[PDB]
Amino acid sequence: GSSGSSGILLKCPTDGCDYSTPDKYKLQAHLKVHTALD
Ligand SMILES: [Zn+2]
């Protein structure tokens, strides 16, 4: 990665995952990738 102006990062709680985002609702929309599949 690299440095720059952004918010505080939130992280995925799931085992073997590496995802992070500055938004709480983008994170909830990512938790659906582990709790459901289509
Ligand atoms: Zn994840």
UniProtKB/Swiss-Prot annotation:
Its tissue distribution reads: Isoform 1 is strongly expressed in placenta, spleen, kidney, testis and peripheral blood leukocytes. Expressed in CD4+ and CD8+ T-cells, CD19+ B-cells and CB14+ monocytes. Isoform 3 is strongly expressed in placenta, ovary, tonsil, CD19+ B-cells and CD14+ monocytes.
User: Where does it localize?
Assistant: Nucleus; Cytoplasm, Cytosol
Positions binding Zn(2+) 8 in this chain are C12, C17, H30, H34
* Recorded superkingdom: Eukaryota
- Where in the chain are the C2H2-type zinc fingers? 10-34
Give a short account of what the protein does.
Answer: May be involved in transcriptional regulation. Overexpression causes down-regulation of a number of genes involved in the immune response. Some genes are also up-regulated.
What name does this protein carry?
A: Zinc finger protein ZFAT
